[PDB]
């Protein structure tokens with residue numbers, strides 16, 4: 001229970017995982033700050049708290065803030081993982097049977113702490129069509145959705161994708177705060193190693209030669225959503241500097257532009273590459289991850305849910321480096337829900 | 342309203358910020374030393390809490406014109422004379438003000454500079470230069486600095502421009518204007534939202550305003566943007582809170598587009614009259630929201646005797662990652678090195 005941090009490689013990605021282990025004093029400091037926020041503010045995503053969240057985040061332990069800041073500017077990061085936060089399992093109570101029942105009094109402190117960590121990386125956002133536009137969402141298995149294509153699945157693999165791949169307002173980070181995970185169930189993660197892929201295919205993937213359609217998981221805004229399915233814009237899968245390209249792809253919702261067989265080939269080459277390159281991150285209770293959604297796709301393996309209140313439960317959040325850029329898709333300046341207007 | 346958000350520092354708050362800036366000056370060589378900039382976001386967290394609270398309110402106010410932090414400590418005697426050229430303005434005595442500007446700026450985003458402006462420095466200098474009185478660059482004096490979005494030509498233009506006044510003995514005003522969409526017409530707004538305009542790089546990006554030795558390759562992109570400007574919009578985003586991107590001296594409508602030419606001269610008249618004054622006294626730091634306002638500087642008579650007006654300046658981005666195609670490597674802050 002000493003503080004430690006370091007770099008865990010995956011293939012050629014030398015800083016793929018940045019791991020921080022909290023000392024017991026650091027875990028207690030973070031818990032005390034989250035509990036004070038829960039006393040003073042309405043909700044982990046109420047306007048009063050989110051106006052202050054980026055400043056309150058500055059009260060987290062300094063050594064942790066320095067390591068999170070290094071992760072924030074690492075444009076080859078896959079996952080920042082902060083291990084060893086305090087979770088009182090007894091006080092938390094059972095895993096709820098549905099996200100609609102999961103915004104519990106006992107779990108508030110973990111929503112506040114997830115937003116505090118997240119607010120070191122950017123500004124938290126949610127989505128009108130996802131869990132009623134909650135910014136702090138819940139990942140837990142739902143009975144009768146075992147074979148579903150959403151994060152409430154268990155028995156079937158959650159297929160890998162860039163989060164909200166279709167959207168110009170897609171998150172920079174996806175945050176996950178594990179409350180319990182008795183069977184050590186993993187998030188799957190992959191990035192592109194351009195040195196494992198034919199330069200010709202990489203060139204095609206930088207072309208605006210693909211359609212990324214919304215999941216059925218997804219008005220001027222919702223007019224844009226109907227258009228995105230029926231008349232999808234021609235988009236690239238890779239963008240930015242050749243030395244540090246961003247990745248945007250959905251294994252289930254990406255196709256080449258009509259009649260572009262070459263693009264179809266490059267896409268299916270990339271799908272097989274990322275499929276073969278998938279690795280896993282397991283979050284024990286009190287472990288928090290931020291996936292760099294610019295760099296990695298993510299999903300989840302089949303697992304065996306009991307639905308007895310002991311199942312895996314994460315709090316989840318989306319983070320943007322640039323809240324202002326999505327103002328056209330938000331209700332007002334301070335509102336954080338994409339597609340609310 | 343709160344378009345201008347002012348924080349007047351207490352003596353303790355001024356002293357705390359000065360102590361932190363001097364601690365940075367004791368540790369690091371330059372206010373844009375790579376080691377300092379890696380450390381800057383967390384060091385900024387050590388600024389006074391009441392100040393960080395008001396900077397955060399400004400950061401999330403999408404109608405902000407400027408945040409002004411008044412009353413930082415500036416030792417005029419220790420600072421010495423105003424240098425005669427920005428090339429000579431990286432003085433030992435002024436380091437502490439460069440460090441403090443970066444600390445305030447790092448609450449709002451990440452600092453960036455330009456390969457094609459003041460030799461790619463991140464902390465730049467605004468002071469009158471003999472022979473540039475009637476120029477269109479920040480070193481002008483006799484000729485008003487025409488109102489502009491900073492680096493309006495570039496998709497990597499700053500979200501905030503930071504100005505730290507070291508010296509302003511004649512109270513020369515910074516000029517500011519926002520756009521009222523209601524007050525120009527829903528008609529003109531529709532035109533301005535169209536990609537029907539040419540915005541060229543301003544003269545500060547030319548090799549004539551950089552050291553002679555600076556690589557020709559840096560200027561290729563600037564010369565291309567002067568010769569062959571892309572068709573771009575002046576307004577973007579939400580109709581209720583649209584962003585503004587225009588330079589009064591370097592913006593034209595696309596050839597043939599009479600409707601666009603009319604929209605632009607309507608905008609130029611609306612912004613010209615609305616232009617209002619903010620005077621930055623010694624120790625005053627302003628952050629202009631470069632998405633919401635154009636800014637300039639009133640005409641003034643420079644004395645060229647070492648007493649002249651002197652600001653430190655910085656560009657701040659909300660999203661450093663978005664410009665990686667234009668930067669040499671992940672941590673490099675100089676736009677146009679790639």
Ligand SMILES: NC(=[NH2+])NCCC[C@H](N)C(=O)O
Pocket residue numbers: 477478479480486487488489491492543544545588589590591
């Ligand atoms: N309309 C103008 N004068 N535009 C250029 C403004 C000054 C420019 N930002 C500089 O540093 O020199």
Ligand SMILES: [Fe+3]
Pocket residue numbers: 151163
């Ligand atoms: Fe997902």
Ligand SMILES: [Fe+3]
Pocket residue numbers: 489490491502636637
């Ligand atoms: Fe300017």
